[PDB]
Amino acid sequence: QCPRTPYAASRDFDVKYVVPSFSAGGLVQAMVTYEGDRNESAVFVAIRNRLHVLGPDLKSVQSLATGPAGDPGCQTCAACGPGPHGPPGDTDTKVLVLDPALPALVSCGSSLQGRCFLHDLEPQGTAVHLAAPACLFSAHHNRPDDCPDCVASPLGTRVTVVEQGQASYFYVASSLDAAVAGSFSPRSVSIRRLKADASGFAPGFVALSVLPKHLVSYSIEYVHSFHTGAFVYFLTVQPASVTDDPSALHTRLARLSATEPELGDYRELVLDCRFAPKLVPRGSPEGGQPYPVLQVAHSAPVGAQLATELSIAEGQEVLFGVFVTGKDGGGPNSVVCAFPIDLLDTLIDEGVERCCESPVHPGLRRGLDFFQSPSFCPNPPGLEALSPNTSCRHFPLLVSSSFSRVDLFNGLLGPVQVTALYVTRLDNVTVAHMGTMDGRILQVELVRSLNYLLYVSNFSLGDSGQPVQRDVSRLGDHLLFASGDQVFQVPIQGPGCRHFLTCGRCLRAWHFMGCGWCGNMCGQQKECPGSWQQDHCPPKLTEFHPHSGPLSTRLTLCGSNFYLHPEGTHQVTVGQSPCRPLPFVEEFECELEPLGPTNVSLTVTNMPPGKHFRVDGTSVLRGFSFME
Amino acid sequence: CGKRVDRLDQRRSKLRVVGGHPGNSPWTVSLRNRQGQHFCGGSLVKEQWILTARQCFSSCHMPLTGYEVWLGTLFQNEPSLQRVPVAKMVCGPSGSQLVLLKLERSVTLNQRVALICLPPEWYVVPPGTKCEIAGWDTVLNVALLNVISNQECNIKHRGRVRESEMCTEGLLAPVGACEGDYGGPLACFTHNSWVLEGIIIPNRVCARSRWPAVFTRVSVFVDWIHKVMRL
Ligand SMILES: *[C@@H]1O[C@H](CO)[C@@H](O[C@@H]2O[C@H](CO)[C@@H](O)[C@H](O)[C@H]2NC(C)=O)[C@H](O)[C@H]1NC(C)=O
């Protein structure tokens, strides 16, 4: 009887695509991209001590020396003015962020006490120059117990730039230790106005810094940060407690207002994604197995078919997070799982409430011991009564109820760690543009998938097989990925249609790919527009059940492209001479008649449209004897 | 409110318009930080209240006790003075960039201390109208300004002047309300009275020949302002 063809055997991801790129000079340290008004645009790509401005075709129009410090070349360092400017060493680029309002580009590296640098953008016909830099470090305002201009940490930092009113605000998070906080500190969290005279950053601002005792163990990574709605959000990876093992990491989401420059509302939520494999593995507490370390994330609006899942409305922003296991487990390596934004808020709002009201659950935790002082809700840090002069809600807190979800891909991702994510919304559907450690790109629809991934593309970025950099950026219909010393530009609609090995999968492609079936291969129109067609597709007969009958006989034909979405009405079958149609794989039953080791041919004609594509044609198999 | 004969010039220093110069501004004040130095300037709206800009302060909830106001003087470094501490602060609604300020004790008026008239709710200032702007060398420097429309200035400001703002036309002189002068008032003369229509806030580029200047519109938020004091 009937066999079964695995939904692969149609995908062949071993097909290579060349796709334009840009040699760096060395390993890429960051990138960020402009999309100005006059359809102007750039792509800015940094390395160790150089800065690369690119055109809209990854062609380096202007490069510029960002280091080394203590060495008469690097313009940034020289624009700081008459020396000394030190200590000397290599300038490694920890921030590359642009302020759309000026416009202007920022760049802050691990030389020069973490000072930033401004680069007024100078336009060109679909191109952009960076006019010479202007050091963001006021001489007479800075000091070792208070350097307001110290934005960049050498231990990795992130910055989100925000327009409030008529000046630009810099929400800012940095990791710190002893050798950083010691003196000329960048300070963990802060919000900073950029002075209108470009001289740097207005002094004063309240900022937060992991307290002296916990500078050593409790190091916080800052994986990602963004602006949406009326809030700057900050995405983290840190130990689950001050007194628990420093090897016990766990991702959180830290929030701040996007219209209200103060840390008085420093809310922190604990995200918590896990894997749920039916069986449930050994050391895991029901619900799923925890992947508590985020390796990248990206927020984006979702499609119809995804909003329904997740129970939300089309258009709504949704953070997505690419979680890996604690340390390096042993199961799938990467789990991606959606957190929608509104609901992250609505938790944190009811997070706030339960901490500040009439009856207060006695024995709660405002917490964040690592930042401020411990204190039970509602009363503020250290202090033991809530004196009505101040409020409760005007203090930083940690919303205890964590936020929990389950991998969107039931562990199908599989063993190769995902390293970079960029979620978009290609028309009414939605797609995740994943990058892996083994040097490959995974463009895959983002529907909660049960049994398999809905592949758009999986292919290797170039030949040097190297991990794809976290921070991924975009231009028109062309994402930029980075790996090693190179930068690649992948089109949002996946490069080719030449992995779909069968007119089956090929004509099931999501419109935008342009995929049509050119006879004995799939491909866009470019590749064979004599015979490129996107409509019809011929039935493939694989085998049958009774393989030798007498001169009735209930043949069961077994193949694919048999049904409409069973079928019936009209399909011919000539099993050496007349048979008779009588009511993965698609099977069938055919009672046959006498004659007055032949082949077995099936033929679909005058057949109505399928959802995706139309079935018509003949395929003929051998091997059916006659018995007397 | 809002009446000086004082600076014999009220309608006679419209000659020295092209340029910034020294002069008097009684309602303008000088907010004094905890350490001692001047850091931002204000606007006497009542004896108890000082309307000023949100950006002067880092956080709406920082302890103020120590923060003080200096009404009376011209110079910023002599019993022709007053020294009133700040008791509290009231952070105006998202986007006002406004900050009222109750004082430890109501002030006393004279020649160089005077209230200023708050405008009607949502009353718009006609282009062509004349307004003034004080600021801090070691002395005050008033300067007279021409009002222009949000139409007019959104050209040069690249369509980025929101509905709750106004702009004055650019002085040809390189002089304008910039750093350390924010929160100082933008008094406009109407129906024989000076009337607080704006508040010096940060601009993108400041004190730049022939370039406009944006201020936050007070009439736009006065219903808030009264509510803050009345009670
Ligand atoms: C993307 O396709 C590649 C190509 O096969 C996959 O890499 C293989 O992974 C399988 C298990 O998935 C290994 O056992 C193979 O030996 C791998 N070999 C090579 C040469 O790649 C990868 O698994 C695919 N990823 C996704 C999401 O489909």
PDB file of N, CA, C and O in Angstrom, chain B residues 102-134:
ATOM      1  N   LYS B 102       6.254  76.835  43.742  1.00  0.00           N
ATOM      2  CA  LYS B 102       5.879  77.521  44.979  1.00  0.00           C
ATOM      3  C   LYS B 102       7.167  77.938  45.693  1.00  0.00           C
ATOM      4  O   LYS B 102       8.171  77.209  45.646  1.00  0.00           O
ATOM      5  N   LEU B 103       7.142  79.107  46.334  1.00  0.00           N
ATOM      6  CA  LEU B 103       8.293  79.605  47.080  1.00  0.00           C
ATOM      7  C   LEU B 103       8.048  79.499  48.585  1.00  0.00           C
ATOM      8  O   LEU B 103       6.917  79.705  49.036  1.00  0.00           O
ATOM      9  N   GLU B 104       9.113  79.270  49.361  1.00  0.00           N
ATOM     10  CA  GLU B 104       9.031  79.282  50.836  1.00  0.00           C
ATOM     11  C   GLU B 104       8.188  80.437  51.379  1.00  0.00           C
ATOM     12  O   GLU B 104       7.512  80.271  52.385  1.00  0.00           O
ATOM     13  N   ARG B 105       8.216  81.600  50.726  1.00  0.00           N
ATOM     14  CA  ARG B 105       7.383  82.744  51.169  1.00  0.00           C
ATOM     15  C   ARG B 105       7.134  83.799  50.069  1.00  0.00           C
ATOM     16  O   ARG B 105       8.034  84.148  49.304  1.00  0.00           O
ATOM     17  N   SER B 106       5.903  84.302  50.018  1.00  0.00           N
ATOM     18  CA  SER B 106       5.476  85.202  48.960  1.00  0.00           C
ATOM     19  C   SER B 106       6.390  86.409  48.922  1.00  0.00           C
ATOM     20  O   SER B 106       6.826  86.884  49.961  1.00  0.00           O
ATOM     21  N   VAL B 107       6.703  86.890  47.723  1.00  0.00           N
ATOM     22  CA  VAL B 107       7.670  87.982  47.582  1.00  0.00           C
ATOM     23  C   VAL B 107       6.997  89.338  47.731  1.00  0.00           C
ATOM     24  O   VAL B 107       5.774  89.450  47.760  1.00  0.00           O
ATOM     25  N   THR B 108       7.831  90.364  47.817  1.00  0.00           N
ATOM     26  CA  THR B 108       7.362  91.734  47.875  1.00  0.00           C
ATOM     27  C   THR B 108       7.770  92.486  46.606  1.00  0.00           C
ATOM     28  O   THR B 108       8.906  92.374  46.155  1.00  0.00           O
ATOM     29  N   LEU B 109       6.837  93.239  46.035  1.00  0.00           N
ATOM     30  CA  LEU B 109       7.078  93.925  44.770  1.00  0.00           C
ATOM     31  C   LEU B 109       7.692  95.313  44.963  1.00  0.00           C
ATOM     32  O   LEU B 109       7.786  95.807  46.087  1.00  0.00           O
ATOM     33  N   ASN B 110       8.114  95.928  43.860  1.00  0.00           N
ATOM     34  CA  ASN B 110       8.710  97.260  43.889  1.00  0.00           C
ATOM     35  C   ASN B 110       9.030  97.717  42.445  1.00  0.00           C
ATOM     36  O   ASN B 110       8.204  97.512  41.557  1.00  0.00           O
ATOM     37  N   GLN B 111      10.197  98.331  42.206  1.00  0.00           N
ATOM     38  CA  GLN B 111      10.610  98.727  40.848  1.00  0.00           C
ATOM     39  C   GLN B 111      11.111  97.536  40.041  1.00  0.00           C
ATOM     40  O   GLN B 111      10.687  97.337  38.901  1.00  0.00           O
ATOM     41  N   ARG B 112      12.028  96.766  40.625  1.00  0.00           N
ATOM     42  CA  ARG B 112      12.675  95.650  39.917  1.00  0.00           C
ATOM     43  C   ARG B 112      12.260  94.288  40.494  1.00  0.00           C
ATOM     44  O   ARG B 112      13.090  93.390  40.656  1.00  0.00           O
ATOM     45  N   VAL B 113      10.980  94.183  40.851  1.00  0.00           N
ATOM     46  CA  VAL B 113      10.298  92.922  41.095  1.00  0.00           C
ATOM     47  C   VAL B 113       8.843  93.187  40.734  1.00  0.00           C
ATOM     48  O   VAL B 113       8.219  94.095  41.293  1.00  0.00           O
ATOM     49  N   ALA B 114       8.296  92.428  39.792  1.00  0.00           N
ATOM     50  CA  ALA B 114       6.909  92.640  39.372  1.00  0.00           C
ATOM     51  C   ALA B 114       6.330  91.380  38.768  1.00  0.00           C
ATOM     52  O   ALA B 114       7.050  90.586  38.178  1.00  0.00           O
ATOM     53  N   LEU B 115       5.026  91.189  38.924  1.00  0.00           N
ATOM     54  CA  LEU B 115       4.354  90.032  38.336  1.00  0.00           C
ATOM     55  C   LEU B 115       4.281  90.223  36.824  1.00  0.00           C
ATOM     56  O   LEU B 115       4.568  91.315  36.330  1.00  0.00           O
ATOM     57  N   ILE B 116       3.886  89.174  36.102  1.00  0.00           N
ATOM     58  CA  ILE B 116       3.544  89.317  34.684  1.00  0.00           C
ATOM     59  C   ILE B 116       2.184  88.681  34.372  1.00  0.00           C
ATOM     60  O   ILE B 116       1.833  87.627  34.910  1.00  0.00           O
ATOM     61  N   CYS B 117       1.427  89.334  33.499  1.00  0.00           N
ATOM     62  CA  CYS B 117       0.101  88.863  33.149  1.00  0.00           C
ATOM     63  C   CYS B 117       0.188  87.558  32.353  1.00  0.00           C
ATOM     64  O   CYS B 117       0.832  87.494  31.307  1.00  0.00           O
ATOM     65  N   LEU B 118      -0.428  86.504  32.882  1.00  0.00           N
ATOM     66  CA  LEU B 118      -0.690  85.298  32.092  1.00  0.00           C
ATOM     67  C   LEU B 118      -1.766  85.659  31.077  1.00  0.00           C
ATOM     68  O   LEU B 118      -2.621  86.497  31.363  1.00  0.00           O
ATOM     69  N   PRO B 119      -1.743  85.022  29.897  1.00  0.00           N
ATOM     70  CA  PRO B 119      -2.691  85.354  28.844  1.00  0.00           C
ATOM     71  C   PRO B 119      -4.006  84.616  29.021  1.00  0.00           C
ATOM     72  O   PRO B 119      -4.127  83.828  29.952  1.00  0.00           O
ATOM     73  N   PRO B 120      -4.985  84.865  28.131  1.00  0.00           N
ATOM     74  CA  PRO B 120      -6.172  84.018  28.058  1.00  0.00           C
ATOM     75  C   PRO B 120      -5.808  82.567  27.761  1.00  0.00           C
ATOM     76  O   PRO B 120      -4.668  82.289  27.393  1.00  0.00           O
ATOM     77  N   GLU B 121      -6.748  81.646  27.938  1.00  0.00           N
ATOM     78  CA  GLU B 121      -6.507  80.266  27.547  1.00  0.00           C
ATOM     79  C   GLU B 121      -6.533  80.206  26.011  1.00  0.00           C
ATOM     80  O   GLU B 121      -7.471  80.698  25.377  1.00  0.00           O
ATOM     81  N   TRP B 122      -5.470  79.632  25.437  1.00  0.00           N
ATOM     82  CA  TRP B 122      -5.320  79.396  23.990  1.00  0.00           C
ATOM     83  C   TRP B 122      -5.250  80.659  23.120  1.00  0.00           C
ATOM     84  O   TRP B 122      -5.437  80.570  21.902  1.00  0.00           O
ATOM     85  N   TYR B 123      -4.980  81.822  23.714  1.00  0.00           N
ATOM     86  CA  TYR B 123      -4.841  83.056  22.921  1.00  0.00           C
ATOM     87  C   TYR B 123      -3.527  83.094  22.148  1.00  0.00           C
ATOM     88  O   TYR B 123      -2.441  83.029  22.736  1.00  0.00           O
ATOM     89  N   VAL B 124      -3.654  83.250  20.831  1.00  0.00           N
ATOM     90  CA  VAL B 124      -2.538  83.182  19.892  1.00  0.00           C
ATOM     91  C   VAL B 124      -1.958  84.581  19.622  1.00  0.00           C
ATOM     92  O   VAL B 124      -2.698  85.564  19.547  1.00  0.00           O
ATOM     93  N   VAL B 125      -0.639  84.664  19.474  1.00  0.00           N
ATOM     94  CA  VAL B 125       0.041  85.951  19.347  1.00  0.00           C
ATOM     95  C   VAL B 125       0.185  86.293  17.866  1.00  0.00           C
ATOM     96  O   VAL B 125       0.710  85.485  17.095  1.00  0.00           O
ATOM     97  N   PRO B 126      -0.281  87.490  17.455  1.00  0.00           N
ATOM     98  CA  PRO B 126      -0.165  87.843  16.042  1.00  0.00           C
ATOM     99  C   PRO B 126       1.277  88.090  15.641  1.00  0.00           C
ATOM    100  O   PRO B 126       1.995  88.756  16.384  1.00  0.00           O
ATOM    101  N   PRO B 127       1.709  87.542  14.484  1.00  0.00           N
ATOM    102  CA  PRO B 127       2.983  87.944  13.892  1.00  0.00           C
ATOM    103  C   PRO B 127       3.039  89.461  13.779  1.00  0.00           C
ATOM    104  O   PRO B 127       1.998  90.097  13.648  1.00  0.00           O
ATOM    105  N   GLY B 128       4.229  90.043  13.881  1.00  0.00           N
ATOM    106  CA  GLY B 128       4.364  91.504  13.894  1.00  0.00           C
ATOM    107  C   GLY B 128       4.356  92.119  15.285  1.00  0.00           C
ATOM    108  O   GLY B 128       4.973  93.160  15.502  1.00  0.00           O
ATOM    109  N   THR B 129       3.656  91.480  16.224  1.00  0.00           N
ATOM    110  CA  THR B 129       3.644  91.887  17.636  1.00  0.00           C
ATOM    111  C   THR B 129       5.060  91.913  18.190  1.00  0.00           C
ATOM    112  O   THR B 129       5.926  91.172  17.716  1.00  0.00           O
ATOM    113  N   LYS B 130       5.302  92.777  19.174  1.00  0.00           N
ATOM    114  CA  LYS B 130       6.631  92.906  19.778  1.00  0.00           C
ATOM    115  C   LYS B 130       6.697  92.332  21.175  1.00  0.00           C
ATOM    116  O   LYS B 130       5.920  92.717  22.063  1.00  0.00           O
ATOM    117  N   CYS B 131       7.644  91.410  21.340  1.00  0.00           N
ATOM    118  CA  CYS B 131       7.920  90.719  22.600  1.00  0.00           C
ATOM    119  C   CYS B 131       9.390  90.934  22.954  1.00  0.00           C
ATOM    120  O   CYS B 131      10.164  91.366  22.107  1.00  0.00           O
ATOM    121  N   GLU B 132       9.766  90.631  24.194  1.00  0.00           N
ATOM    122  CA  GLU B 132      11.119  90.878  24.708  1.00  0.00           C
ATOM    123  C   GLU B 132      11.658  89.638  25.414  1.00  0.00           C
ATOM    124  O   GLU B 132      10.881  88.825  25.916  1.00  0.00           O
ATOM    125  N   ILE B 133      12.984  89.524  25.499  1.00  0.00           N
ATOM    126  CA  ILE B 133      13.607  88.394  26.178  1.00  0.00           C
ATOM    127  C   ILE B 133      14.910  88.740  26.889  1.00  0.00           C
ATOM    128  O   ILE B 133      15.934  89.005  26.257  1.00  0.00           O
ATOM    129  N   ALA B 134      14.869  88.691  28.214  1.00  0.00           N
ATOM    130  CA  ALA B 134      16.047  88.920  29.048  1.00  0.00           C
ATOM    131  C   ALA B 134      16.967  87.705  29.069  1.00  0.00           C
ATOM    132  O   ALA B 134      16.624  86.662  28.548  1.00  0.00           O
TER     133      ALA B 134
END
